[PDB]
Design a protein around this nucleic acid. Structure first.
Ligand SMILES: [Zn+2]
Ligand SMILES: [Zn+2]
Ligand SMILES: [Zn+2]
Ligand SMILES: [Zn+2]
Length: 1271
RNA sequence: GGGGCAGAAAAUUGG
RNA sequence: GACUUAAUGUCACGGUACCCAAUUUUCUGCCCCGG
């Protein structure tokens, strides 16, 4: 007769739905799906506020199910009073159906009450159902209910105004994933509610019969789930901030637009988001990277003036203005506001199925056997991330709960309201369903519109499993990972291809709870649990999440404890302890002597080698290939966003990870260097696609090609999964990172271009101290022999060195020196994976000035090569998408010998040896070295051979600064004084010159790759006696080239390329070291280490898809003959750096032949290649009067080749007793170092009356012409 | 009598 | 006590936001005549 006040509390995020009564419910789909949830009603107009509740019929149905199970446990009795089976059928002619219909099994027992229930006397089950009362199916007064359930209202703790929907709920999209294809079929939305603040409901139950109070009070403690969440039932006795950020973002955007730097703004946007990982101290202690020393403009982005002041001080005042919103939200909103303002001021703004009627209404009774036992098993443990993980979520401003009717980061991660990482229940349940279907061998696809319960084994085992959601104890921000796609025809970045993913740290831990209520513990669930866990030898194989092909989401299970609860003897202890729901964290730390009564540990849990679904169905599913790459070159996988926000002021730095630690709950102090999984996934995919030839297809829609089978497409998932490549020997290095700076050289002036100096910071790789990267990839069961052969072929192509890792591969960065395969790799994979060339061409030098002399003449140190104006441009560009049969591909092994001393400085250390303490401002350097090994960079060799190849084949001026203007006023810039055909190639529509076709442009990758040269043998360190280091030399003063001497007199044109002369002018510099160290300021000259003549260096050149004449011209540009050499390094006017390259070996390979391999290519074939190049030069010339035949080619019949080989002629080589005297003039006598009667000043040469302008230009164009008697 | 350049140009998402 | 349930019948713990894409292409740390 007396009321019972009931409080239900949630321990999991529950579900919400809108309220429609009964007739408006059939119009909407979300409410018909959303029964057995919690309900939300709007209070007042405007669709903003309301209240949530839980209906009494839902709690009544839960209590009815609990009473049915509790009576089925004790065989139709409860504390001595027996009950009948009840009634669950309603005839259609007498009365109406009760507004909710049952599709599940009804548990029944043997009715031993020996009496039929009527209105006068009844069993507890019949008075708890409410069969014999005065109320039914149409409401009347609240009396004449024998048992009444009221509605359950939300216990708001503080009395306030109405509660909003956006403070209680959050929207989410769930999925249904097909098992055969791995792609989604349909999706549906839901609302999830918080349980920490809004998870308590209170209601009333009225019972007017003191015969079923004990069954009701026992059944209230047996209810386990309600509204999609674990529960416990007990009996009691901002817009101003967005706008203020928007106006300041507009201020910064107009400030960058005033300086014509709008395209930087987008990059700055990402930098602001990256500032959420650092502290506020990076704006407070000003740890942003500073500019160069003695520069007016500092950092190129942190010192851009915003309304009069710098950017860092502007961010300081902007954070002092909005310190009240926190650092993380301020950085996120400032980034996601700069993104929108950049998107507006540019000009361009940035299958839903719910389940289902009339017919097939049945009643299915189920009676268990009388002897059977029922138990409940509980498995507790921790889940650990062995890789970065990703749980996908839709964007904010689309996941608003009320406004469902229908940016900067493309893909976000799922987080809690306190910014904690969350493994949802749906992902764990889907992964358990997938692994259980794999373990059983067979299963069904999940049918949604259902009238009969499914009878497959997976569904029977999954209707007895209860899980629980997980949240970590970690609230630090995620990491952004970027991804591009490559255009396979040009080997550059495709248009509209950059996107970004948010990933979490590896090593994080989550709680894990599983429950099973049944008669015996299955072998298949034991197999899945043993498959998911890790031990010694075995690693975990629990794939949760949504980037599995790139290796994201592999978890392991540790600290597993399994407990058992008996229900036929210890049911009251289960009801009293509430199944330990919400107290499972205490069970991991509980001892054996503190367990509650009735809960024992489980001892017959079968081991890994005794389970039959394991090792037959689950273990052969994914196979592991683990290997180790040895890289003997610098390795640069650029970041370009983290380079902006760290101190050092560098352009491109390497890639780092953040690994989380479990023993100490911090992250880690030191990061881990790595190559991403997407990178070597793309390397494998590009290798397989270029071998088979499937990269040339225009579309892969409904494709069953080999690449789409191995690597997946839109309609199928991938059969191979790739993990990261981690550095494993980083503690063997001192100064692991190396600073390498690069420059571009103008083809006319010979000096450095404006705004073309840059720095790279790769990891220090050497041929005697290589980097070691350990990596792993997973392969699936069901691969054929052809596809395994393709994977083995891709690994062999990576090992042979065709695909370099990282960036700047054409100048020698990231060249793979070797690959090793571990011993635990499958055996079929181990079976599958495991003289001197001369030119003899003597060039006749300039006979008239030089060879008839006793060295009494002075020449000019640089001359100009003047070709015509026509450049041959090809519009059929050779593509990078396959290896063609008629073209050539291979490698050249070459050597390098010094004829004159060589200076290659190491500009990472400005102090170098010493000597800035004694004389300050003096720059002194060492030779180039990585880990103490003398090297020449591949960029210098590439630039030297590129300048030679461009001057040989009459191509365009590739690097040429056209904004410079002359003064003696000038008519125009010197870009206007060049012909339009020698201008650099822009775009592929007009075509490409030969130099841009072989070496590349911005929109076309090159087809030649130069490597780092290593020291082999010879006498090093030219020794001078009076010098503070003996291996050292103080150079003369050298400053910028003046184009006013080459083109005076405005009606004059640019006289072609600039080349230097070979002479032994360093012996003047050596003997006068004392006269240079004094009487010259120490801030003008430089001191460097020098190498002597006779040293040998070794390097390699790779090439792919070259024609025959291109290879002939390349082998001619490398070794152009006897008495012709090259020029390399510093001090080229003073004579330094004369090198000779000799070809040692040539190898060619053909991949289209199945069994063929690398070759040796004897001297007849390469002579044929040289002749095929010479015939192409003759055909480009136009003079077809020269005959054809098998003669050794005379290269000096073409005029510009004759001028080029007169510019590069070595006069002192094979004991010919002559040495020229090449030096600059002396600028207006009474100047230092002037001969008595030479008359070699600039005053005499720069007058009009003696040496007019045309004779001066003609003397700067004719090679080796004299200048002191002047011709 | 004196030092310069010290990053520039694309892609910032589509099926 | 309304807003806000119907009582002899609620498998929604009946459904993984899933699938596809190499942060990359090009560049000699170089260099003389006048304010
Ligand atoms: Zn009864
Ligand atoms: Zn099924
Ligand atoms: Zn295909
Ligand atoms: Zn060109």
């Amino acid at each position: 007769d007396m009321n019972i006040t009931v409080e239900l509390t949630f321990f999991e995020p529950y579900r919400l739905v809108e309220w429609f009564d009964w007739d408006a419910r059939k119009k909407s789909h979300s409410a018909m799906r959303g029964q057995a949830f919690a309900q939300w009603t709007w209070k007042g107009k405007g669709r903003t506020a309301g209240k949530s509740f839980i209906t009494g019929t839902l709690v009544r149905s839960a209590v009815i199910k609990a009473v049915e199970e509790l009576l089925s446990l004790n065989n139709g009795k409860w504390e001595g009073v027996p009950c009948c089976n009840g009634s669950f059928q309603t005839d259609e002619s007498k009365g109406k159906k009760p507004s909710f219909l049952r599709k599940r099994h009804t548990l029944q027992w043997q009715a031993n009450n020996k009496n039929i229930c009527d209105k006068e006397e009844a069993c507890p089950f019949c008075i708890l159902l409410g069969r014999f009362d005065n109320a039914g199916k149409v409401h009347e007064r609240n009396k004449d209910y024998d048992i009444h359930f009221s509605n359950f209202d939300l216990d708001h703790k503080q009395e306030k105004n109405d509660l909003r929907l956006v403070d209680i709920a959050s929207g989410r999209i769930l999925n249904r994933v097909d098992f055969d294809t791995g792609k989604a079929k349909d999706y549906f939305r839901t609302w999830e509610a918080d349980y920490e603040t809004y998870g308590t409901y209170t209601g009333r139950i009225t019972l007017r019969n003191e015969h079923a109070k004990k069954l009701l009070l026992a059944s209230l403690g047996f209810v386990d789930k309600l509204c999609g969440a674990l529960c416990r039932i007990e009996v009691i006795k901002s817009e101003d901030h967005n706008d203020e950020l928007r106006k300041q973002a507009e201020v910064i955007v107009e400030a960058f637009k005033q300086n014509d730097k709008l395209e930087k703004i987008r990059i700055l946007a990402d930098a602001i988001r990256t500032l959420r990982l650092h502290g506020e101290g990076v704006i407070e202690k000003d740890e942003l990277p500073d500019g160069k020393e003695e520069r007016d403009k500092g950092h190129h982005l942190w010192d851009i003036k915003v309304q009069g002041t710098a950017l860092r001080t502007k961010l300081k005042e902007l954070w002092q203005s909005n310190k009240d919103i926190g650092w993380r939200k301020f950085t996120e909103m400032l980034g996601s506001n700069l993104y929108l303002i950049y998107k507006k001021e540019t000009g361009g703004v940035s299958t839903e199925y719910y389940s289902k009627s009339e017919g097939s209404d049945l009643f299915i009774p189920v009676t268990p056997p009388e002897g059977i036992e029922t138990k409940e098993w509980i498995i507790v443990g921790r889940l650990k991330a062995a890789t970065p993980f990703y749980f996908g979520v839709q964007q904010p401003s689309d996941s608003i709960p009320g406004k469902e009717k229908k940016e900067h980061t493309s893909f976000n991660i799922l987080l809690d309201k306190e910014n904690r990482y969350r493994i949802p229940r749906s992902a764990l349940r889907g992964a358990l369903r997938r692994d259980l279907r794999t373990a059983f061998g067979s299963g069904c696809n999940v049918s949604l519109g259902g009238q009969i319960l499914c009878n497959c084994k997976v569904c029977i085992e999954m209707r007895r499993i209860t899980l629980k959601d997980s949240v970590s104890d970690f609230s630090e921000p995620p990491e952004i990972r970027y991804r591009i796609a490559k255009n396979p025809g040009t080997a550059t970045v495709e248009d509209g291809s950059l996107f970004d993913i948010e990933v979490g740290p590896e090593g994080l831990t989550f709680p894990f709870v599983l429950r099973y209520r049944g008669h015996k513990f299955p072998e298949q669930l034991s197999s899945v649990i043993r498959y998911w866990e890790e031990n010694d030898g075995k690693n975990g194989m629990a794939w949760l999440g949504g980037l599995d092909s790139t290796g994201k989401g592999r978890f392991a299970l540790k600290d597993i404890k399994i407990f058992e609860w008996d229900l036929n003897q210890k049911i009251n202890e289960y009801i009293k302890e509430r199944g330990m729901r919400g107290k499972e964290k205490e069970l991991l730390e509980m001892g054996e002597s503190s367990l509650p009564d009735g809960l024992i540990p489980y001892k017959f849990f079968e081991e890994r080698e005794c389970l039959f679904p394991y090792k037959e169905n689950l273990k052969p599913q994914w196979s592991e290939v683990q290997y180790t790459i040895e890289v003997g070159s610098p390795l640069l996988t650029a970041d370009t966003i983290s380079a902006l926000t760290e101190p050092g002021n560098r352009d491109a730095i390497a890639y780092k990870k953040r690994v989380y630690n479990d023993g100490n709950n911090a992250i880690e102090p030191e990061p881990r260097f790595a190559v991403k999984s997407e990178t070597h996934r793309g390397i494998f995919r590009t290798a397989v696609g270029r071998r088979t030839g499937d990269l040339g297809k225009e579309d892969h829609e409904d494709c069953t090609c080999d690449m789409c089978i191995i690597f997946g497409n839109e309609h199928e998932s991938s059969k191979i999964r790739f993990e990261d490549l981690e550095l494993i020997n980083g503690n063997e290095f001192e100064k692991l990172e190396k600073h390498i700076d690069h420059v571009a050289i103008d083809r006319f002036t010979g000096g450095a271009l404006d705004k073309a100096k840059f720095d790279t910071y790769p990891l220090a790789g050497s041929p005697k101290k290589p980097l070691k990267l350990k990596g792993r990839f997973w392969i699936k069961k069901g691969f054929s022999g052809d596809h395994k052969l393709l994977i083995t072929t891709a690994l062999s192509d990576i090992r042979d060195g065709l695909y370099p890792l990282g960036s700047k591969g054409g100048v020698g960065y990231g060249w793979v020196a070797g690959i090793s395969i571990d011993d635990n790799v499958p055996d079929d994979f181990k079976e599958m994976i495991n003289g001197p060339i001369n030119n003899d061409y003597v060039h006749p030098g300039h006979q008239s000035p030089k060879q008839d002399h006793k060295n009494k003449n002075i020449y000019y140190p640089h001359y100009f090569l003047d070709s015509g104006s026509k450049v041959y441009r090809e519009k059929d560009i050779i593509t990078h998408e396959e290896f063609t049969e008629e073209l050539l591909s291979g490698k050249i092994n070459c050597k390098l010998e010094t004829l004159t001393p060589l200076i290659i400085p190491d500009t990472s250390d400005e102090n170098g040896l010493k000597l800035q303490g004694n004389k300050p401002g003096h720059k002194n350097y060492k030779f180039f070295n990585i880990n103490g090994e003398l090297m020449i960079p591949g960029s210098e060799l590439r630039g030297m051979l590129r300048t030679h190849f461009e001057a040989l084949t009459k191509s365009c001026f590739a690097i040429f600064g056209e904004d410079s203007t002359l003064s003696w006023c000038a008519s125009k810039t010197l870009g206007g004084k060049l012909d339009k055909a020698l201008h650099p190639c822009t775009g592929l529509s007009d075509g490409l010159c030969p130099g841009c076709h072989l070496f590349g442009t911005t929109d076309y990758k090159g087809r030649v790759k130069f490597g780092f040269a290593k020291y082999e043998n010879g006498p090093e360190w030219l020794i001078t006696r009076g010098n503070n280091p003996e291996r050292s030399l103080t150079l003369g003063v050298l400053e910028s080239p003046r184009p006013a001497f080459s083109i005076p007199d405005d009606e004059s044109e640019i006289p072609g390329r600039k080349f230097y002369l070979h002479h032994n002018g360093w012996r003047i510099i050596r003997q006068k070291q004392l006269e240079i160290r004094e009487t010259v300021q120490p801030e003008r000259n430089v001191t460097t280490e020098v190498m002597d003549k006779g040293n040998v260096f070794s390097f390699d050149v790779r090439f792919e898809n070259l024609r025959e004449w291109e290879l002939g011209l390349l082998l001619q540009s490398l070794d152009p003959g006897k008495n012709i050499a090259h020029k390399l390094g510093k001090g080229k006017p003073y004579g330094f750096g004369s090198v000779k390259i000799k070809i040692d070996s040539l190898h060619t390979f053909k991949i289209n032949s199945n069994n063929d391999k690398i070759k040796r290519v004897p001297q007849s074939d390469i002579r044929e290649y040289i002749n095929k190049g010479y015939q192409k030069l003759i055909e480009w010339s136009g003079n077809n009067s020269i005959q054809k035949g098998n003669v050794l080619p005379q290269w000096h019949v073409i005029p510009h080749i004759d001028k080029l080989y007169k510019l590069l002629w070595v006069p002192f080589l094979n004991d010919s007793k002559l040495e020229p005297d090449v030096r600059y003039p002396v600028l207006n006598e009474e100047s230092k170092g002037y001969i008595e009667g030479s008359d070699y000043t600039y005053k005499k040469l720069g007058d009009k009356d003696n040496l007019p302008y045309k004779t001066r230009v003609k003397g700067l164009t004719t090679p080796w012409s004299p200048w002191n008697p002047f011709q």
